[PDB]
Amino acid sequence: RDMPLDSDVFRVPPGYNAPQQVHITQGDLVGRAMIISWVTMDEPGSSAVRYWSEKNGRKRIAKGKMSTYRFFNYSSGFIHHTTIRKLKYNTKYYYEVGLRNTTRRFSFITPPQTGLDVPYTFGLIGDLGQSFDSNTTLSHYELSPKKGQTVLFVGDLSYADRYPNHDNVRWDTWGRFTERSVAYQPWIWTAGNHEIEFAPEINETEPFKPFSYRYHVPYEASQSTSPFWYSIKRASAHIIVLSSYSAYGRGTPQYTWLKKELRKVKRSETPWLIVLMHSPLYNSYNHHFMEGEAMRTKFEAWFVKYKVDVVFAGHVHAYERSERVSNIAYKITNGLCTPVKDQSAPVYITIGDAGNYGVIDSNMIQPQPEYSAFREASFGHGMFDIKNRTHAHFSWNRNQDGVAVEADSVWFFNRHWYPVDDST
Amino acid sequence: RDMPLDSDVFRVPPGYNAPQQVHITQGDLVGRAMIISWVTMDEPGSSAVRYWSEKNGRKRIAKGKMSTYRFFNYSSGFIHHTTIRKLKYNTKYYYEVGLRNTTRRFSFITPPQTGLDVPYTFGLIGDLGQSFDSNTTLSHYELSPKKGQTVLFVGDLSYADRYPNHDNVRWDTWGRFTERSVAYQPWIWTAGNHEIEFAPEINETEPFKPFSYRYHVPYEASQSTSPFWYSIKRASAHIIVLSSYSAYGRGTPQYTWLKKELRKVKRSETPWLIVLMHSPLYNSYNHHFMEGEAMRTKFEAWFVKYKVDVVFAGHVHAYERSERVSNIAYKITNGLCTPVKDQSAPVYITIGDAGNYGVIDSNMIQPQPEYSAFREASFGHGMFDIKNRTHAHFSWNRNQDGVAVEADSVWFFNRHWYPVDDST
Ligand SMILES: CC(=O)N[C@@H]1[C@@H](O)[C@H](O)[C@@H](CO)O[C@@H]1O
Ligand SMILES: CC(=O)N[C@@H]1[C@@H](O)[C@H](O)[C@@H](CO)O[C@@H]1O
Ligand SMILES: *[C@@H]1O[C@H](CO)[C@@H](O)[C@H](O)[C@H]1NC(C)=O
Ligand SMILES: *[C@@H]1O[C@H](CO)[C@@H](O)[C@H](O)[C@H]1NC(C)=O
Ligand SMILES: *[C@@H]1O[C@H](CO)[C@@H](O)[C@H](O)[C@H]1NC(C)=O
Ligand SMILES: *[C@@H]1O[C@H](CO)[C@@H](O)[C@H](O)[C@H]1NC(C)=O
Ligand SMILES: *[C@@H]1O[C@H](CO)[C@@H](O)[C@H](O)[C@H]1NC(C)=O
Ligand SMILES: *[C@@H]1O[C@H](CO)[C@@H](O)[C@H](O)[C@H]1NC(C)=O
Ligand SMILES: [Fe+3]
Ligand SMILES: [Fe+3]
Ligand SMILES: [Zn+2]
Ligand SMILES: [Zn+2]
């Protein structure tokens, strides 16, 4: 039950070669860069981006690259990617795009410089899709009383691969649909299984093709060699994005990168350490049960050793919050294979209930395991609101409830600065 | 302990632009084709191969392709790959390489047509390397009273990545060193961790580059979209090669391929079902202990479901033989996490003790776990001798013993045709 192509939210902006499917993301490691992306259908157009700060009227111009691609019998429009760098912290900027022809204007606010007690509020959306439910979820996030300043996307964007030949037109519609948000505030991308799009039948064998062309990330900023895993620092948070569907065996590029990246985290500069991945390591629902075991046996010990605060995942179309637990004492024949409470371990949260194609995962493992703190099969999104270097407030909002109602509220105590039990 | 560059085995064949590092491998699914590979140092040369059988002296010519590559400050020679097809079963063929300049001649015997009771004896070599120990291992294989007709190589070829800048010259020496065998009988390649060669420091970020240029495989024959995993049928055996260091999460290329491939296995046509991978799923040695857990949680259930006979792995530089066990009843909180004997499960064998750079893994998990049937820290190789559709004899030969001494022998009873307890 996705929204029909004639839906108001898929409407195409008027004007000749008008920029469409506009979206932004952090373009550097510390937050003083932004990647501006958009598509033009009528003709190539300019890849220039004109921007200026609200205060200093000095208008500047940055040039970018343009690209195109074909999936099966599908031909893309003209995709533009431009990186604006050397921006100023905590300041509003205006940027215009589509200079040569029909011009459209947007704005964004750079984050404050990275610091120990710098407050910031992140949005959490996963497996959004483009169904009526998806629109409701996006609305609640926009109307949220505690305004979100950046969204952390945990995977499965458009779900265009459910249509015949993965009808890439559904990638375009999703681009216009989400523009109302991603054009004004950055979204941090995480690749999900619906982005793999491995279709040998139609001779499309390169994983993540549509996705990688449409969405760029500043992976090079963290010494990564691939766009499916990277980290960025923003305000008081250090965010690490992992790829559930890439190699992660010992010696592999992702494995090597993650190992070095954790050593580089400085809790004195960024107290909150967050990890994003599409498939959850802890999940008590029947759908995709134990799918995350493979990655868990490889990185769990590291998450505990470095005391990461929270791990966000999607994939399971529902909501779940775990107690701080670890299962790293197993040794094949020592029988220690039951998850135990660990104050050094992170809290795992499944938040992939933004809407997808309108289906909710209800069937859950019974009885509720001990490692599961709270769970519910309802659509919605979440908010991770950072206050101090010691306190962060997380909340989950349902689509049935009012915009300001928090069906689930939890205070997180930083594992590095305030290591006290924060169970609920 | 690596053999010095002046060692006799690394001798470069005389003659202008003489073909060197000649090696062959199966070129199709059933064995009526061969991929002939070689290198020329003085100049490109022809990529043609002239071949003929003992009977019909009819000489034919097949034209292949030539390619080169660079690593750091290393420049490869001219690499040639030619595929000879439509060969006749169980017949001896002669083939010449380097037609334009100085020609060299070799021979090989195609396997018999695939059948239910077709006998065939495979060799098992893993983590060969090029140390003095490596030369001994290869010698014992050549002198084996029961001559091997094809080698199943379980990973880690040259170990050139141990030298500064992975001195690719060490790939060339290894090519000349092993030529005395691989040029006369096929070797089935499996990629190991030393083939990854991920070296960002020197701007070499493409995994498996040196390896993939030098060693080609008939992966397309099995519908695979990558040379790191594929299968082949030879005599009464259906061999499946997996990549321990590639993506294998649900929905990924490898995962999808394996799932489909197992369905296509016909025990009525090829009774023996063998799987190759570099990292052992069961291992009681300290070195690399539990590294195979990630892939294990992914594919173990399938191996049992389809009753694969034997799984061969290397990586650990020693020898180990498990009993038929399985650890697939685990459900996170049900406590069933101990391996149990299973007559439907394969026997796991690790033979990565061919030599490498002269180091052997002697540290073992004490006491010996119940799932481990035999283990020993000695250099050697193995032989898998198929008799009928019901019986196959496996033997392990140490380098200290005589060429005909079997330090460990075991009869394998086919899991499909002769489902009886073959424990020792
Ligand atoms: C292939 C080549 O040009 N040889 C040189 C080698 O002699 C030198 O010691 C090394 C140092 O980095 O660089 C190159 O590999
Ligand atoms: C004498 C000799 O061996 N040189 C020939 C050269 O003349 C020719 O152009 C080339 C083409 O394959 O083959 C050899 O290199
Ligand atoms: C693309 O190809 C499919 C083939 O199944 C066809 O049904 C569809 O109409 C085509 N779309 C366009 C507009 O090319
Ligand atoms: C749109 O911009 C292109 C690129 O500079 C230019 O060639 C073309 O004349 C413009 N079209 C319009 C809106 O007139
Ligand atoms: C989506 O939500 C917006 C904001 O509430 C609304 O204006 C629009 O009509 C909705 N579109 C659909 C198709 O539900
Ligand atoms: C963090 O916030 C909490 C409540 O929002 C407050 O009680 C606490 O003192 C703050 N951290 C500090 C010590 O400044
Ligand atoms: C390698 O072994 C062969 C016998 O198979 C022998 O002729 C040769 O001398 C040996 N070379 C080295 C360097 O050990
Ligand atoms: C299998 O081989 C063994 C010894 O090689 C023999 O005893 C047995 O009878 C054979 N079975 C068949 C199918 O002939
Ligand atoms: Fe999803
Ligand atoms: Fe090895
Ligand atoms: Zn998913
Ligand atoms: Zn290895």
Author numbering:
A (entry chain B), B (entry chain A): 9 to 432
Sentences from the paper on this structure:
In this study rkbPAP was co-crystallized with sulfate, and diffraction data were collected at a resolution (2.4 Å) which is better than that for any previously determined plant PAP structure. The Fe(III) and Zn(II) in this structure are separated by an average distance of 3.1 Å, similar to that reported for the other rkbPAP structures. Spherical electron density is observed 2.1 Å from Fe(III) and 2.3 Å from Zn(II) and therefore in a bridging position. We therefore assign this density to that of a μ-hydroxo group, an interpretation in agreement with a previous study involving measurements of the magnetization of rkbPAP under catalytically relevant conditions. The Fe(III) is coordinated by a nitrogen atom from the side chain of His325, oxygen atoms from the side chains of the chromophoric Tyr167, Asp135, Asp164 (which bridges both metal ions), and the bridging hydroxide. Zn(II) is also pentacoordinate, ligated by the side-chain oxygen atoms of Asp164 and Asn201, the side-chain nitrogen atoms of His286 and His323 and the μ-hydroxide. Mechanistically, it is important to stress that the μ-hydroxide group is the only water molecule present in the active site, and given the location of this group the fitting of a sixth ligand to either metal is implausible. In contrast to the phosphate-bound rkbPAP structure, the sulfate ion in the active site does not coordinate directly to the metal ions. Instead it is positioned in the second coordination sphere, stabilized via an extensive hydrogen bond network involving His202, His295, His296 and the Zn(II) ligand Asn201. Thus, the rkbPAP-sulfate complex demonstrates, for the first time, how the pre-catalytic complex predicted from stopped-flow measurements may be formed and stabilized in the second coordination sphere of the enzyme.
Purple acid phosphatases belong to the family of binuclear metallohydrolases and are involved in a multitude of biological functions, ranging from bacterial killing and bone metabolism in animals to phosphate uptake in plants. Plant PAPs are 110 kDa homodimers, containing Fe(III)-Zn(II) or Fe(III)-Mn(II) centers, and a recombinant isoform from sweet potato has been shown to contain a di-iron center. The characteristic purple color is due to a charge transfer transition between a tyrosine side-chain and the Fe(III). In this study the structures of the rkbPAP-sulfate and rkbPAP-fluoride complexes were determined, providing insight into what we propose are two crucial steps in its catalytic mechanism, (i) the pre-catalytic stage, and (ii) the chemical step.
